[PDB]
Design a protein around this ligand. Structure first.
Ligand code: HEM
Ligand code: HEM
Ligand SMILES: Cc1cc(N)nc(CCc2cncc(CCc3cc(C)cc(N)n3)c2)c1
Ligand SMILES: Cc1cc(N)nc(CCc2cncc(CCc3cc(C)cc(N)n3)c2)c1
Ligand SMILES: C[C@H](O)[C@H](O)[C@H]1CNc2nc(N)[nH]c(=O)c2N1
Ligand SMILES: C[C@H](O)[C@H](O)[C@H]1CNc2nc(N)[nH]c(=O)c2N1
Ligand SMILES: [Zn+2]
Lengths: 403, 404
């Protein structure tokens, strides 16, 4: 009736009771599981999400049933009944943002969930103001390499007027320039956004590591272009502890992983621009960004520099080079004194988070395929851990690209 | 778009729609409210409709649907059930059904080979001694001195109130695990229980790290009987590393033949409780899981110490570096010994080819993403980037409760 969840390394068992709090359907049915798919394919409804949320908030501060709790529910009813919508109090927004992170099933970093700096940017009325808020977020989160989790929340969606949006999917990414011969210079994942930036009048570089500008959009306005001050964008040159030639590859990556395309939903309210940042787990850079064939795709280059036999899969040249590239990321971040976490440390801390959440809430939604690192899966404890995936609210959700 | 799941490959950008899932007559463990895809575990009217379905599959596969022979086989099946409560497969129906069960297996990455399976028919078997002879024959044929061949042997089906044929071992070839005075295990900790059952049934145990277990074989309504595999039948590979000379000194080894013996083969509602099957290894199975799982041989630290790695800190990636080398030792050693093996790059490339064959042949392919993606270097292989749809099609292999 409630799922049994087993750890196959330790033989331990728990039952997930939290999943019964889910109000929103995922993509699976009893006929077929779609858990590996990356994306999904009135006033009465909003009123009940708002009440549930408010009840969640008062219970978190152990004031369920208090005067303040009753009056806050009344304010919400009154506001929705007159206007079709309502507004959160700053402390509620702060609580809601932390829960959305807590509830995010694809995030291996959730042991940190209670430590989140929340910037209230709901008094934003222009793309220019958005830029200032974003620059302040970056500065704060970066903190000369001693990275601090942060979210900045721009004004909620409103009925029949356009959304505040950040067109970039990350606050910091590298340009991808489609070339004469159909190869790509830079990050092939960012060709389409790079082309939007130029079409909105950016003067592009021609390097492999050109930091993109921001396209910021205030309601029903053309997006506006803003170049990030280069001193705000902390970057780490990549070199290798023992392989002296690695540095000559001229590789580098940015310190700050900052998501800017997801929608933050709290209490039925939607925040279409609400960028958030933490710190990197080294496999995102070392394995995916640098080694994916449709990304920087450097594996063969590295393996050749290591003089490995590239002619056959069975020499395991790919595996060997992937490991050295990940080590080089860790070492370089450590050398530059910029916060990073390796995939062993991160998954061990995630296991601890599972245990905390089990006692706190009776379960924890997790997407096994996202939680298990892209190299050395079974070498980490999360591989051997069964997981239950489901949608709780508050939530981060994916949304359509604004163009 | 089409009212079927849309399946995307994120490396190549290509899209397909799975229409095959519409054929699934059995529910998995997911609902709209929660995904349970990462969990390792989960009479006349019913039988007849399963039987009719399988026979339609058989006649379809030989392109004779609606044919006079098709309707006659249907009538024959219902009459058998009508008068006996059960029915029996023709020989070519069994060959087809066994290959289809393998084809349908969502967790098997080796399915490009599905059409090439030697089906040994052992539905005449009537004793544990005879099961032993059949199993020994299978092992000999399958191993083929290192040039391995996929094979399954099918013992008589489950029958109305009569005991099952069962092999108690989960695999035909496994190593003993001996519970020690100090609570540790010598050999394979996975196999403590089966090791301890073999002893209770009179096996004289060894005390190595790599002692091949005897077989505990159960004919209908008898206690299981014990059979020692003659050692010259069990091909093993000593492990060495191509450049690390000390690796051979560790005395590690593995057996050639991966042979599952505890799974139930279901075909048209008929249940084959003993139907052991075998192929050849993918190298990560041995080098990553068998040798490096913490709860298995657990050799990662020993190998990292030999490699002189910093095992005191996670960020040295000592675990990753040791695992790679062990995996390389597995591949090198099987290649040297001329024993068929496939690495995880070549296996996953071949499974991508299989997905495209099946897209055209049947409109989809049930696959379990967590099982298909290898346990090291996942995203370096093409399957990591491929969305997959998982559902139960029959014929099927299914897990069964241990007989004890
Ligand atoms: C503090 C350090 C953090 C670490 C080490 C971390 C780790 C990760 C990793 C490795 C992923 C998978 C990323 C990928 O493969 O693309 C991820 C996903 C995610 N994390 Fe975190 N995280 C951190 C902080 C945060 C914060 C502050 C938030 C929000 C406040 C957050 C929310 C999310 C969400 C919503 C996803 C999924 C994004 C998507 O579906 O594309 N995480 N996390
Ligand atoms: C020809 C070479 C083959 C290769 C390389 C191969 C590969 C694999 C691998 C790597 C696994 C996962 C095992 C694990 O993680 O423990 C597996 C599972 C499986 N394979 Fe294959 N396979 C082959 C042949 C076969 C054959 C001949 C059959 C049956 C006729 C089969 C049916 C299955 C089934 C039913 C599973 C799931 C086992 C379970 O759930 O415990 N495969 N295969
Ligand atoms: C199709 C699709 C769906 C989906 N939900 N996400 C994506 C891309 C996800 C993605 C890509 N690059 C980068 C990130 C950033 C992930 C990230 C975020 C944070 C806050 C910390 C951290 N260590 N890592 C996320 C694609
Ligand atoms: C709880 C549980 C459930 C389940 N369905 N399977 C298992 C064990 C699966 C398992 C473990 N070791 C070994 C194998 C053999 C897998 C195997 C089988 C064949 C035929 C070829 C090949 N390369 N590999 C299978 C455990
Ligand atoms: C198809 C598959 O779901 C897709 O490649 C997923 C797999 N696991 C992942 N895991 C993480 N953390 N990030 C990813 O982008 C993906 N991609
Ligand atoms: C918890 C999780 O489902 C479990 O550990 C799975 C993950 N993927 C696997 N994949 C394969 N091929 N074999 C396995 O035993 C497992 N174990
Ligand atoms: Zn599912």
């Amino acid at each position: 009736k409630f799922p049994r969840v087993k750890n196959w390394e330790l033989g331990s068992i728990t039952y997930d009771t939290l999943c019964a709090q889910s109000q929103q359907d995922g993509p699976c049915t009893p006929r077929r599981c779609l858990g590996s798919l990356m994306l999904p394919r009135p006033a009465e409804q909003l009123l009940s999400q708002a009440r549930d949320f408010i009840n969640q908030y008062y219970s978190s501060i152990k004031r369920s049933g208090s005067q303040a709790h009753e009056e806050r529910l009344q304010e919400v009813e009154a506001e929705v009944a007159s206007t079709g919508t309502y507004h959160l109090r700053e402390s509620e927004l702060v609580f809601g943002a932390k829960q959305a992170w807590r509830n995010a099933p694809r995030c291996v970093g959730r042991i940190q969930w209670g430590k989140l700096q929340v910037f209230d940017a709901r008094d934003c009325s222009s793309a220019q103001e958005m830029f200032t808020y974003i620059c302040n977020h970056i500065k704060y989160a970066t903190n000369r390499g001693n990275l601090r989790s942060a979210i900045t929340v721009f004004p909620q969606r409103a009925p029949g007027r356009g959304d505040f949006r950040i067109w970039n999917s990350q606050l910091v990414r590298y340009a991808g320039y489609r070339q004469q011969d159909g190869s790509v210079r830079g990050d092939p994942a960012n060709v389409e956004i790079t082309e939007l930036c130029i079409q909105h009048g950016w003067t592009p570089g021609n390097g492999r590591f050109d930091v993109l500008p921001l396209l910021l959009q205030a309601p029903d306005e053309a997006p506006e272009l803003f170049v990030l001050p280069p001193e705000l964008v902390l970057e780490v040159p990549l070199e290798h502890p023992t392989l002296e030639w690695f540095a000559a590859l001229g590789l580098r990556w940015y310190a700050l992983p900052a998501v800017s395309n997801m929608l933050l939903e709290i209490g039925g309210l939607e925040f279409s621009a609400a960028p958030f940042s933490g710190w990197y787990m080294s496999t995102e850079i070392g394995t995916r960004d640098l080694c994916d064939p449709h990304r920087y795709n450097i594996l063969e280059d590295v393996a050749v520099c290591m003089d490995l036999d590239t002619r056959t899969t069975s020499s395991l040249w790919k595996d060997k080079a992937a490991v050295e590239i990940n080590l080089a990321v860790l070492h370089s971040f450590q050398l530059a004194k910029v916060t990073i976490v390796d995939h062993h440390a991160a998954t061990v801390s995630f296991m601890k988070h599972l245990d905390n959440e089990q006692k706190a809430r009776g379960g924890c939604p997790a997407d096994w395929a996202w939680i298990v690192p892209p190299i050395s899966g079974s070498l980490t404890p999360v591989f051997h851990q069964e997981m239950v995936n489901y949608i709780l609210s508050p939530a981060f959700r994916y949304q359509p690209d604004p163009w």
